[PDB]
Design a protein around this motif. Structure first.
Motif, mmCIF file in Angstrom:
data_model
loop_
_atom_site.group_PDB
_atom_site.id
_atom_site.type_symbol
_atom_site.label_atom_id
_atom_site.label_comp_id
_atom_site.label_asym_id
_atom_site.label_seq_id
_atom_site.Cartn_x
_atom_site.Cartn_y
_atom_site.Cartn_z
ATOM 1 N N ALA A 189 0.878 -1.170 0.000
ATOM 2 C CA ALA A 189 0.000 0.000 0.000
ATOM 3 C C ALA A 189 0.916 1.220 0.000
ATOM 4 N N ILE A 190 1.182 1.762 -1.193
ATOM 5 C CA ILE A 190 2.170 2.831 -1.323
ATOM 6 C C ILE A 190 1.766 4.042 -0.486
ATOM 7 N N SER A 191 0.486 4.408 -0.526
ATOM 8 C CA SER A 191 -0.054 5.463 0.313
ATOM 9 C C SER A 191 -1.185 4.979 1.204
ATOM 10 N N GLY A 192 -1.716 3.782 0.952
ATOM 11 C CA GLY A 192 -2.711 3.191 1.824
ATOM 12 C C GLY A 192 -2.175 2.746 3.167
ATOM 13 N N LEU A 193 -0.850 2.684 3.323
ATOM 14 C CA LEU A 193 -0.279 2.416 4.638
ATOM 15 C C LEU A 193 -0.629 3.525 5.620
ATOM 16 N N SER A 194 -0.557 4.776 5.171
ATOM 17 C CA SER A 194 -0.958 5.923 5.984
ATOM 18 C C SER A 194 -2.477 6.019 5.934
ATOM 19 N N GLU A 195 -3.137 5.078 6.601
ATOM 20 C CA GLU A 195 -4.587 5.041 6.663
ATOM 21 C C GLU A 195 -5.012 4.827 8.103
ATOM 22 N N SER A 196 -6.018 5.588 8.536
ATOM 23 C CA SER A 196 -6.532 5.419 9.888
ATOM 24 C C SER A 196 -6.982 3.985 10.126
ATOM 25 N N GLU A 197 -7.786 3.427 9.221
ATOM 26 C CA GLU A 197 -8.343 2.095 9.447
ATOM 27 C C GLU A 197 -7.247 1.036 9.535
ATOM 28 N N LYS A 198 -6.337 1.013 8.558
ATOM 29 C CA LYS A 198 -5.257 0.029 8.561
ATOM 30 C C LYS A 198 -4.373 0.188 9.791
ATOM 31 N N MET A 199 -3.962 1.427 10.079
ATOM 32 C CA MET A 199 -3.096 1.681 11.222
ATOM 33 C C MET A 199 -3.761 1.266 12.522
ATOM 34 N N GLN A 200 -5.055 1.569 12.683
ATOM 35 C CA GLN A 200 -5.749 1.191 13.907
ATOM 36 C C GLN A 200 -5.933 -0.315 13.991
ATOM 37 N N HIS A 201 -6.063 -0.996 12.850
ATOM 38 C CA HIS A 201 -6.166 -2.452 12.890
ATOM 39 C C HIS A 201 -4.863 -3.078 13.362
ATOM 40 N N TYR A 202 -3.741 -2.670 12.766
ATOM 41 C CA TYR A 202 -2.444 -3.126 13.260
ATOM 42 C C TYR A 202 -2.262 -2.741 14.721
ATOM 43 N N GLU A 203 -2.763 -1.562 15.090
ATOM 44 C CA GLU A 203 -2.599 -1.056 16.445
ATOM 45 C C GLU A 203 -3.364 -1.891 17.465
ATOM 46 N N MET A 204 -4.625 -2.211 17.173
ATOM 47 C CA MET A 204 -5.412 -3.019 18.096
ATOM 48 C C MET A 204 -4.910 -4.454 18.130
ATOM 49 N N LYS A 205 -4.469 -4.983 16.985
ATOM 50 C CA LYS A 205 -3.872 -6.314 16.989
ATOM 51 C C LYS A 205 -2.647 -6.356 17.893
ATOM 52 N N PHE A 206 -1.823 -5.310 17.862
ATOM 53 C CA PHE A 206 -0.628 -5.323 18.696
ATOM 54 C C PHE A 206 -0.961 -5.069 20.159
ATOM 55 N N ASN A 207 -1.983 -4.258 20.434
ATOM 56 C CA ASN A 207 -2.469 -4.145 21.806
ATOM 57 C C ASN A 207 -2.924 -5.501 22.333
ATOM 58 N N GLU A 208 -3.622 -6.272 21.497
ATOM 59 C CA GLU A 208 -4.065 -7.603 21.902
ATOM 60 C C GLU A 208 -2.880 -8.535 22.114
ATOM 61 N N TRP A 209 -1.864 -8.442 21.255
ATOM 62 C CA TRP A 209 -0.629 -9.189 21.480
ATOM 63 C C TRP A 209 -0.024 -8.841 22.832
ATOM 64 N N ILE A 210 0.017 -7.548 23.154
ATOM 65 C CA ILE A 210 0.583 -7.089 24.420
ATOM 66 C C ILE A 210 -0.180 -7.688 25.590
ATOM 67 N N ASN A 211 -1.513 -7.649 25.525
ATOM 68 C CA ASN A 211 -2.323 -8.211 26.600
ATOM 69 C C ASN A 211 -2.119 -9.718 26.722
ATOM 70 N N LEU A 212 -2.054 -10.421 25.586
ATOM 71 C CA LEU A 212 -1.887 -11.871 25.615
ATOM 72 C C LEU A 212 -0.533 -12.259 26.192
ATOM 73 N N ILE A 213 0.509 -11.486 25.887
ATOM 74 C CA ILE A 213 1.829 -11.787 26.433
ATOM 75 C C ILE A 213 1.873 -11.477 27.923
ATOM 76 N N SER A 214 1.226 -10.387 28.343
ATOM 77 C CA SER A 214 1.254 -10.007 29.755
ATOM 78 C C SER A 214 0.492 -11.004 30.619
ATOM 79 N N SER A 215 -0.679 -11.455 30.145
ATOM 80 C CA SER A 215 -1.513 -12.372 30.919
ATOM 81 C C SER A 215 -0.765 -13.642 31.299
ATOM 82 N N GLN A 216 0.332 -13.940 30.608
ATOM 83 C CA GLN A 216 1.143 -15.109 30.900
ATOM 84 C C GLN A 216 2.487 -14.762 31.519
ATOM 85 N N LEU A 217 3.023 -13.573 31.228
ATOM 86 C CA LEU A 217 4.232 -13.131 31.911
ATOM 87 C C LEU A 217 3.982 -12.941 33.399
ATOM 88 N N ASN A 218 2.795 -12.464 33.763
ATOM 89 C CA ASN A 218 2.432 -12.318 35.165
ATOM 90 C C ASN A 218 2.143 -13.679 35.796
#
Length: 276
Positions: A189-218
């Motif tokens: 995505a030459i300019s579609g990378l700079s997109e609210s929807e795409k960026m927020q999707h990657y963002e929420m996926k990584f937030n979920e990764w963070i939560n999943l890793i923490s729930s087991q690190l603790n």
């Protein structure tokens, strides 16, 4: 000549019927030099031939012969040599004189060791070892007494386990899911990378990764449930945090991170490096 006729007989039933390109590969001088040096050489113990395939308007099969054995290179995707069949030739006895007398009178079957492997198989190398050597060593240590038989069995099992793990080790879809377009590739995505929807999707996926890793690190209290259970859970933590370490060390999961950095969306790049 007898060896050439024998290898020709061996080739046809394996993948496809005998072809003039197969014969010409033998007729070629380089393959003849390699076969001769192999027969007369204590040093070289293996012969290899590549049933290379070339895709055009129609499928084409060519055969080459080399000393080097890149069996999984062909299985690796997006390569010129992909979908190429592999043949293995091993000699029994190292001394040239014994190789000579065996070629003159002994059976080519007893005198040569032959190995065939699929093209395009990620766990093929892990499967071969487990299927043959893991069985032979287990039977033989029991049948006859040897030094370090139990240690040998253990070692074979450990290698088998590592090999089995590493086939499915590659990253896909805890389970951390990348974007579909990113699993396709990174900069599509030459300019579609700079997109609210795409960026927020990657963002929420990584937030979920963070939560999943923490729930087991603790961890649990070391006064309860049994010492054996504690040791099992410590080993599980080791292998588990290890699998997740490889998860995070995968390229794609770090490139979606690099995409969040390229978009400056730091609120996920950095909690991944800090809170995790």
């Amino acid at each position: 000549s007898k060896r050439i006729a024998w290898m020709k007989t061996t080739i046809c039933d394996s993948l496809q019927l005998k072809d003039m390109i197969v014969e010409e590969s033998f007729q070629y001088e380089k393959n003849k030099n390699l076969l001769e040096q192999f027969l007369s050489g204590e040093g070289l113990n293996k012969i290899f031939a590549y049933y290379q395939v070339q895709e055009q308007a129609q499928n084409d099969d060519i055969k080459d012969t080399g000393a080097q054995d890149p069996v999984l290179f062909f299985t690796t995707g997006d390569l010129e040599k992909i979908q190429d069949k592999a043949v293995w030739f091993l000699r029994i006895t190292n001394p040239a004189d014994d190789k000579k007398k065996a070629s003159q009178q002994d059976g080519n079957d007893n005198d040569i060791i032959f190995g065939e492997i699929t093209p395009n198989t990620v766990p093929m190398l892990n499967a071969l070892m487990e299927s043959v050597y893991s069985r032979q060593i287990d039977h033989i240590i029991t049948e006859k007494i040897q030094f370090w038989g139990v240690a040998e069995e253990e070692q074979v099992l450990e290698f088998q386990q590592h090999s089995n793990k590493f086939s499915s080790e590659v990253r896909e879809a805890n389970l951390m899911s990348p974007g579909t377009e990113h699993f396709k590739l990174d900069y599509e995505a030459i300019s579609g990378l700079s997109e609210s929807e795409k960026m927020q999707h990657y963002e929420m996926k990584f937030n979920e990764w963070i939560n999943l890793i923490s729930s087991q690190l603790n961890r649990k209290d070391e006064k309860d449930a049994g010492p054996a259970t504690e040791l099992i859970y410590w080993r599980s933590r080791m292998q588990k945090i290890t699998n997740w370490s490889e998860q995070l060390k995968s390229k794609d999961f770090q490139i979606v991170k690099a995409s969040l950095q390229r978009h400056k969306n730091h609120d996920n790049q950095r909690p991944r490096g800090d809170e995790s």
